[PDB]
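Objective 1b of the project was to move from sequence-level analysis to a structural picture of ligand recognition. The entry below was assembled by the postdoctoral researcher (A.K.) and checked by the PI before modelling. It contains the amino acid sequence of the target and the SMILES of the bound compound, zinc ion.
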Amino acid sequence: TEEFDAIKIALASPDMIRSWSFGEVKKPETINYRTFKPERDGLFCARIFGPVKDYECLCGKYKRLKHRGVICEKCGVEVTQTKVRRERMGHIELASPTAHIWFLKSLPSRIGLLLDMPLRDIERVLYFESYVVIEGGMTNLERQQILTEEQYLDALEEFGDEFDAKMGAEAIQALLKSMDLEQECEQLREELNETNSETKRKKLTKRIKLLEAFVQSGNKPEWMILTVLPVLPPDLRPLVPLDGGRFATSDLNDLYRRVINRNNRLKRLLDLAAPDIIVRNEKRMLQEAVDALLDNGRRGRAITGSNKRPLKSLADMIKGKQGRFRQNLLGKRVDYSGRSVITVGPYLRLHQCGLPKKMALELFKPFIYGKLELRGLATTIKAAKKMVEREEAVVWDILDEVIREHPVLLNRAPTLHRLGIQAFEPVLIEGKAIQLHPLVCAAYNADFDGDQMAVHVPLTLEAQLEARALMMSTNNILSPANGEPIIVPSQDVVLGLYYMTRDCVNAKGEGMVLTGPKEAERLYRSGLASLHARVKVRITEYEKDANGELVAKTSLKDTTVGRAILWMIVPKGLPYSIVNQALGKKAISKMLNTCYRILGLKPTVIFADQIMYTGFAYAARSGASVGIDDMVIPEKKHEIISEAEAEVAEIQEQFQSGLVTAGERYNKVIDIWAAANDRVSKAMMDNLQTETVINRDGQEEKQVSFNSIYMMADSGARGSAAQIRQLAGMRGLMAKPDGSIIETPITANFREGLNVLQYFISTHGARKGLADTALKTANSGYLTRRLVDVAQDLVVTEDDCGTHEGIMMTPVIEGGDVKEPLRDRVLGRVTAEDVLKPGTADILVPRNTLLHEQWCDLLEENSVDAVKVRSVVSCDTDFGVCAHCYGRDLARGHIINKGEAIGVIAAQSIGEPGTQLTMSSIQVKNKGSIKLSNVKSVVNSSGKLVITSRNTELKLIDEFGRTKESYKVPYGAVLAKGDGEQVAGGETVANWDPHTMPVITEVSGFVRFTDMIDGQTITRQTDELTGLSSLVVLDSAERTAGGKDLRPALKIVDAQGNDVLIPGTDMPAQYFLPGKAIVQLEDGVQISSGDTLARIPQTGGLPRVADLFEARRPKEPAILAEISGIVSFGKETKGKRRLVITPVDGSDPYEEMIPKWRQLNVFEGERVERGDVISDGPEAPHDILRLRGVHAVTRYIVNEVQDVYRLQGVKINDKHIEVIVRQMLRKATIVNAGSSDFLEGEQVEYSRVKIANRELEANGKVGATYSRDLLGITKASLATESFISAASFQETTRVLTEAAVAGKRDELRGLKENVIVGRLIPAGTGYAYHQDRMRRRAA
Amino acid sequence: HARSTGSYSLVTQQPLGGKAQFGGQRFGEMEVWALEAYGAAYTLQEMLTVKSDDVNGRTKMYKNIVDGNHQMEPGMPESFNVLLKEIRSLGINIELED
Amino acid sequence: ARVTVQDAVEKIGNRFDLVLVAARRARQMQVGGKDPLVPEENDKTTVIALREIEEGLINNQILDVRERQEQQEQEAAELQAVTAIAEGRR
DNA sequence: GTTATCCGCTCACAATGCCACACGCCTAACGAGCCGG
DNA sequence: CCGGCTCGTATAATCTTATGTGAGCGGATAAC
Ligand SMILES: [Mg+2]
Ligand SMILES: [Zn+2]
Ligand SMILES: [Zn+2]
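Corresponding predicted holo structure:
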């Protein structure tokens, strides 16, 4: 029907089924097919469902339209349309009751969770193997106690009429309604208030939440068991018309026939007083038959004749890649469409495409019919059909009137990102292929290798106007993933423009003088002066530094004839120094980009067209071919290979004498072949790039070459140094598929021949790369599918949330070069707070403005290192994202409008380039200030600097204050310098030992042995070839039971032998000793201030991004600190080693367990702040969230995923990854109960908690306390309020079972739901629809 | 291969696929993500409802084009009623409120 | 013909009010039978609607003002017809 | 002893889109049919 | 002169190169 709100779901009562149906099927036969009338009371019928033909009795009595409503008596068939055959249900009244298969085997077992009874027991009740007891009463036995035949017989001896024990589905049906619901809830609530054990509280909170949701619905525990089973309207499972004889049956019809045969046989056996064994067996057969009908997968049994495939049950018509969500309710086939192969056609403009004439007559047939019947050239529709099937000459003029302003959508099939479908205007072509403008071809990522494209037609008025405004190809220049133009001129235009704008030192007409650029053109056409000969010309140029107008300026510049020709298509704005250089690929790309920045939109489009036209024209007049004498072999290749063979023979002889081992032999050979390959490549590149010597009109000079493939590489059209390296120099080192890299490299190039073995070796890398591509495609597609499932319901919905939180951005520095500066990251995001000038108390930026480009430069000039800026993850708006929390939009210019469905474009921007992926001393480098962060150090006796703080960090600074470089300075290392010591570059400023942990002291004196007994705790090991016998101290577990209860310790004393206190505190720090602690300076030996007491020895591709957005737990994570306090070890081997951290003021209830196998960092007297590392390794983000706050997990995810995308040169803006992070941490647990109705262990979406706390804080009550969860993206999709949006995604079965038990109700808000139903989307245009509806509802 | 108005399937009232059976193209799922990614709203409504699965909607649209008036009639897709009728074939009540 | 759109998005508010306003103007121009302000150049109604948007003679406030004015004139004219019927009866 | 945990075994559920093309989708034995021997 | 043959048709049966997850449940496991 129409005008309906939210969809409601619940269980279905038997009386509801009798309210549905229109008759009772009794006979299992479909049709007689002697005559093809349907059999009465079969699966097909006419009295039950409806008329076979239109408006006719099956008897054939009433055949007139004016007899509607009155049924026949010859056939009992209501004279109605055959659409009624699509819509009337049927019912079957079963003999025995029957268990539903989903509620038994969803696995959370709904019956088993409800009755508190294990699943296997209920299974061997339902399949007739046991008994249950139903109100035994004055009986030894209990209720849920189950038996066998022997205990049942012995009970019949004992309590022969007391207990009531049944079996089969009737017994479970008896147990279900015998149970109350209120008493179980109140009893188990009192029991949960009388329980402290955790797992019992888990199970009981599950059971009472099940019961409370089950009572707050409408339904009952009787309804999980079927009694009356409904059947589908028989047009919806149609009988296949074959050719000759019989009709081919579907799967549903065979399953219903089997069920009805079994039901009739059981009903007759009940009619004749059958013995008990046979009716038990028959009820088991009927239960198994209904379990085969509803879902064939739990018992994979029903297979048909001549095709041993599982038949398609009703649940198989919903799941999978062919059920009604993925197949038919999202991707529908569409009329007015078409398909062809494509073809270039370089004469087009940017906003049009080539359309075949005949196919365009075929598409627009109704518009043609309307134009013909308008102009009087026809009267009926059949006259118009005859005229357009004759293809008379008036029809082509009519078709050209139909085209003129009516755009057409074009599409390429594996659509990744939102530039995949675009709208053009048509230009008619007598042909059979679709022409397509060549600049757009990079955006589609189209070949011309046979790639096919498709055509759709917008046909209403709003669709034409949207395809003109929102989607015409003159409106998509910048990319939504990053603000870069997608209209880069490709390979051939690059070659043309690079060949035009060069120079050579002696040509025709060199050094003459010219008037305009057009006289240089007239000299090029006549053949008087060549295309590139240097010449002084006169140029006028316009500069718009005047505030909104143009300033002329005329001068004489030393330039080239080709550059003067190219200047004629540059518009008024740009300065002449944009076309004075050699103009490769990136140069003309930034030419287009600066033309977009300074002038606007329309000169950018028309300038890209003029560039494409003249680039193809002069690429034609070049004649740049390629030939076998354009690949210059070096003259020095032969002796380099000879010297490499001499060196490998010498290393082979040094291995043969036995001096060098095999691994170092391997390493020397691979190093010298790497060096030889690099030398040959250097020689060939130096021989190609500059060999061209030409006569000056003096003697000789040098210049950049005019060789063919060097122009094809130096312009950046096709190829790199690597491909042109393999063509003439030798090719690399081929690696075998085991993972090793082979000894002998391929000594030959491609211009010479390869022999048999070397080609056979190269085949390995070929097939490896091909298989990698073949699997990488599918994995990227699946990950894109899941991300756009997650982020779909999120729309920029209001203007200004108006908060004062956010994040702090600093330009990222690994320690090598600064990877991303502050300009590129925080271009175009709205400032959180007023970042002050380095001139203090001077407002450099207002707190609530937008960092546009000029403003970004004026922020850059004062060398700001950290800017605070508003993110999406802290935006305040319920059910959406505020506008100023998201900033300016990519692919357009200004701030984002209210409605842009940013979650979908974000998921596409992450998931689009997924195909391109794959599947001992600190040394400063420049001069600046030396800053050490979290440093607490002391100079020892030997002048070295040992640090008593773990978290020391190195910052190389300039004179300004911005960070030049950064490194990590370990705890207590060998430091060549101190803090703030102004040093210069190239300096190794630090060192340490990777096999010695610092057990450094704090005072001077002696070190004495407390509980360090040789034979109990410590051992005396003599280094047998040096002479310094030392002591080795283990931990408690590695030594035996003689020192297991003992704790060895190096007690820090003075030279007298007494504990000198730490300067600042009053605590003696005796040093208890961990394992592998080699104590060198023993008792009686004087120590220093912080001296080494004990020496202690110790992915990346696409699945990294997959395992990160799943947020799955890494192996052996890093233990953090829960709250600050003094560390204290405790009891050993109660599973693990205990640890108690005592706060300064609060108590210490948490006594954390640590596997003593894994190592540790902190010491006993040491105390650390919360969230700090204990055992090194990977980290799960759960801990990062619950300890370091909310922004920390966003920064961790952004930096890691952005490292994986910076490794391949892929540039993706950060706000997309932020708005994917927001949809991951939306659920929440509750810590208290609060003052409202929320339970404690209640998982609940955060925004409802936030509006509940806002409503309670409006009054004077107390709120609730919540811990923000963090789920995987598939777990976040699969737990959503809309039960449609979780049904369309994977595991539809479990979602429909849980949603049908709970009886939910889906508001239809979001994108995916309204696509399913088929009204306007609440995202784009139609957003302005929905709130216009919403104010209609509330008022 | 092209199509203006051709044949339809039996179970769901969608057009067929292929060249030989005079079919229309599969405007699949990822293209729906792409139209959601623009601000395109009405065009998604035609590609979902007027071009297929709304019977009275599409015949009203065809007559309305031949008459020379570009309107549309939204309606409700027949495949969704199919989905309702085979969820009701299980034991699951599912209705539409209001 | 018309290639660009950016003369209208800087006149009406965003890229979404332009769609609804120009579709409404073209729908009342095509079928309701009203004469366009600027002259045609044998183009369709969508393009002449976008032209009247970008020059600045059609706007959403202006559409509602004109529709209110002509509808008030319509009900006033049929009230004049009712009073003419009342003159014809008595 | 008995109780609250830790760990190994078993099992459901996912794995891009589109296109063309092409050939496939029962029968040994239980209720009727013909009429010969 | 009913079904022996012959047919219309309704309907039952002895794999064995996969991976990665999560999620749950039965059996051991370390304490007052
Ligand atoms: Mg291709
Ligand atoms: Zn009848
Ligand atoms: Zn906000």
